[PDB]
Design an enzyme around this catalytic site. Structure first.
Site, PDB file in Angstrom:
ATOM      1  N   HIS A  27      10.380  31.278 130.332  1.00  0.00           N
ATOM      2  CA  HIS A  27       9.957  31.391 128.909  1.00  0.00           C
ATOM      3  C   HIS A  27       9.715  32.843 128.500  1.00  0.00           C
ATOM      4  O   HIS A  27       9.869  33.163 127.318  1.00  0.00           O
ATOM      5  CB  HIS A  27       8.789  30.463 128.572  1.00  0.00           C
ATOM      6  CG  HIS A  27       9.030  29.698 127.315  1.00  0.00           C
ATOM      7  ND1 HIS A  27       8.271  29.870 126.189  1.00  0.00           N
ATOM      8  CD2 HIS A  27       9.962  28.778 127.001  1.00  0.00           C
ATOM      9  CE1 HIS A  27       8.713  29.078 125.238  1.00  0.00           C
ATOM     10  NE2 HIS A  27       9.747  28.401 125.711  1.00  0.00           N
ATOM     11  N   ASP A  41      30.428  22.680 124.315  1.00  0.00           N
ATOM     12  CA  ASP A  41      31.591  21.976 124.849  1.00  0.00           C
ATOM     13  C   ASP A  41      32.335  22.950 125.751  1.00  0.00           C
ATOM     14  O   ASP A  41      32.874  23.954 125.274  1.00  0.00           O
ATOM     15  CB  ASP A  41      32.491  21.464 123.721  1.00  0.00           C
ATOM     16  CG  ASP A  41      33.627  20.575 124.218  1.00  0.00           C
ATOM     17  OD1 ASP A  41      33.819  20.455 125.444  1.00  0.00           O
ATOM     18  OD2 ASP A  41      34.338  20.001 123.366  1.00  0.00           O
TER      19      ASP A  41
HETATM   20  O1  LIG Z   1      11.551  22.794 123.384  1.00  0.00           O
HETATM   21  C1  LIG Z   1      12.061  23.891 123.771  1.00  0.00           C
HETATM   22  C2  LIG Z   1      13.384  23.848 124.492  1.00  0.00           C
HETATM   23  C3  LIG Z   1      13.932  24.962 125.021  1.00  0.00           C
HETATM   24  C4  LIG Z   1      15.325  24.858 125.534  1.00  0.00           C
HETATM   25  C5  LIG Z   1      16.341  24.502 124.671  1.00  0.00           C
HETATM   26  C6  LIG Z   1      17.636  24.398 125.130  1.00  0.00           C
HETATM   27  C7  LIG Z   1      17.924  24.646 126.467  1.00  0.00           C
HETATM   28  O2  LIG Z   1      19.241  24.536 126.930  1.00  0.00           O
HETATM   29  C8  LIG Z   1      16.902  25.003 127.337  1.00  0.00           C
HETATM   30  C9  LIG Z   1      15.594  25.104 126.865  1.00  0.00           C
HETATM   31  O3  LIG Z   1      11.269  25.014 123.895  1.00  0.00           O
HETATM   32  C10 LIG Z   1       9.943  24.889 124.049  1.00  0.00           C
HETATM   33  C11 LIG Z   1       9.266  26.256 124.268  1.00  0.00           C
HETATM   34  C12 LIG Z   1       7.952  26.489 123.667  1.00  0.00           C
HETATM   35  C13 LIG Z   1       6.885  25.703 124.020  1.00  0.00           C
HETATM   36  C14 LIG Z   1       5.644  25.922 123.454  1.00  0.00           C
HETATM   37  C15 LIG Z   1       5.471  26.939 122.528  1.00  0.00           C
HETATM   38  O4  LIG Z   1       4.239  27.141 121.975  1.00  0.00           O
HETATM   39  C16 LIG Z   1       6.550  27.737 122.166  1.00  0.00           C
HETATM   40  C17 LIG Z   1       7.789  27.513 122.736  1.00  0.00           C
HETATM   41  C18 LIG Z   1       9.572  23.964 125.262  1.00  0.00           C
HETATM   42  O5  LIG Z   1      10.371  23.838 126.240  1.00  0.00           O
HETATM   43  O6  LIG Z   1       8.507  23.360 125.267  1.00  0.00           O
END
Ligand SMILES: O=C(/C=C/c1ccc(O)cc1)O[C@H](Cc1ccc(O)cc1)C(=O)O
Length: 407
Positions: free
Chosen positions: A146, A355
């Site tokens: 993150h 894709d």
């Molecule tokens: O939901 C997403 C997904 C990320 C992602 C998307 C596509 C991918 O291929 C891989 C990962 O992000 C959030 C992050 C987050 C959490 C708490 C906060 O206060 C601020 C941000 C999370 O994972 O919870």
């Protein structure tokens, strides 16, 4: 019933000058050890060479010629050393159609466990899992740090990694790696009191049960407002449903946490690579949530989101600038618990557009999280115009949660 086959670390094909660059203040709003991870599912087709490993490796190098910080003082940064990106291919004796609707129950062999006790800069920042089944289907498990990038940036990276495998050119604006646009002012002048940084309202009468349950719901009845965004109304309903289903005493403070992408409200450059996620925290007692109308909760969440104007976001950044350390302000893994709640929305995000040249994804979704307290909003790959609500809650409350359908 899954076992590793190969573990590789991939360099870019080109040079990619690896000068260590600066992480933002919002990047420092996470623990030093945390990966956010999800999984992409692909079903086999009539084409030969469905996701060949060598093609994907030589496409990963052509993707890393752009996104080189994935391979790599008193403040956090990990230098672009171009030493390797972990790519573990596995094997399973499974049938992908036995999964059915993909409830993310914790059989975590779709992803690996990482160890940074040997060093926080010893092992790389992202891991992909290519696990191939008996049916010919495959699961691609992504796990990203993150601090480095949010879901938008890693999703753009996987879309570039898709377009550079199907023989297409790079997807949109090429990634921008200077995070100086999220720098604090000079001088830092906070102008607001930030509750996104104050501790969450824990310390309620203790809970008898601790075991939890995950449930993923379909809601085809979005097309009704019983008098605002769709997200604000839906989040108000979910939050009110949870606060009623928990039965907490009136006077107990609950706090809704909402991620908000700050690229649009601010002026961020296109292709911005990093965390631009702020927080929207409306607080209220569980009583006034359960004893008032849905209008109250929806107005509360709308005021929580509408507070995030340019001044407030830059003031939040400056407030982070005034602090001693910032990772001490990052709540998580205990802020998740009752009476608090998270709600996100992957409906607007292009989570199915990757894709690789073999077809679109049958289903992508989150996996293996600190479970309780986090509600997610997902799009249905059946594209019936329906919507998924993936929530985790204590078992005593999941059966109570069925009033979500009661409008
Ligand atoms: O939901 C997403 C997904 C990320 C992602 C998307 C596509 C991918 O291929 C891989 C990962 O992000 C959030 C992050 C987050 C959490 C708490 C906060 O206060 C601020 C941000 C999370 O994972 O919870």
């Amino acid at each position: 019933k899954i076992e590793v086959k190969d573990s590789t670390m991939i360099k870019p094909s080109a040079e990619t000058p690896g000068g260590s660059l600066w992480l933002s203040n919002l990047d420092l709003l996470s623990p030093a050890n945390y990966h956010t991870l999800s999984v992409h599912f692909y079903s086999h087709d009539g084409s030969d060479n469905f996701f060949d490993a060598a093609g994907l490796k030589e496409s990963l190098s052509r993707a890393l010629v752009e996104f080189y910080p994935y391979a790599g003082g008193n403040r956090l940064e990990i230098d672009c050393n171009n030493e390797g990106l972990l790519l573990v291919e596995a094997e399973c004796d499974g049938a992908l159609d036995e999964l059915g609707d993909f409830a993310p129950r914790p059989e975590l062999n779709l992803i690996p466990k990482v160890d940074y006790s040997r060093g926080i800069s010893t092992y790389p920042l992202m891991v992909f899992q290519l696990t191939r089944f008996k049916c010919g289907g495959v699961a691609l498990g992504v796990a990203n740090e993150h601090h480095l990038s949010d879901g938008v940036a890693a999703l753009h990276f996987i879309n570039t990694w898709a377009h550079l495998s199907r023989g297409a050119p790079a997807p949109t604006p090429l990634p921008h790696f200077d995070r100086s646009s999220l720098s604090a002012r000079n001088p830092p002048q906070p102008q607001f009191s930030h509750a996104e940084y104050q501790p969450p309202p824990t310390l309620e009468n203790p809970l008898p049960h601790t075991d939890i349950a995950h449930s993923r719901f379909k809601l085809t009845r979005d097309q009704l407002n019983s008098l605002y965004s769709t997200f604000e109304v839906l989040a108000g309903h979910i939050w009110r449903s949870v606060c009623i289903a928990r039965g907490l005493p009136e006077g107990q403070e609950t706090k809704l946490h909402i991620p908000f992408d700050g690229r649009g409200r601010l002026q961020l450059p296109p292709g911005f690579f990093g965390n631009a996620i702020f927080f929207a925290t409306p607080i209220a007692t569980c009583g006034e949530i359960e004893s008032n109308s849905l209008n109250y909760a929806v107005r509360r969440v709308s005021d929580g989101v509408s507070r995030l104007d340019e001044d407030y976001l830059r003031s939040s950044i400056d407030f982070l600038e005034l602090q001693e350390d910032i990772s001490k302000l990052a709540q998580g893994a205990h802020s998740f618990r009752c009476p608090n709640l998270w709600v996100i929305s992957w409906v607007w995000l292009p989570i199915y557009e990757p894709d690789f040249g073999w077809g679109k994804a049958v289903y992508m979704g989150p996996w293996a999280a600190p479970f309780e307290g986090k509600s997610y909003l997902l799009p249905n790959p059946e594209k019936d115009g329906s919507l998924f609500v993936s929530i985790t809650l204590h078992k005593q409350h999941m059966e109570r949660f069925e009033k979500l359908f009661y409008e």
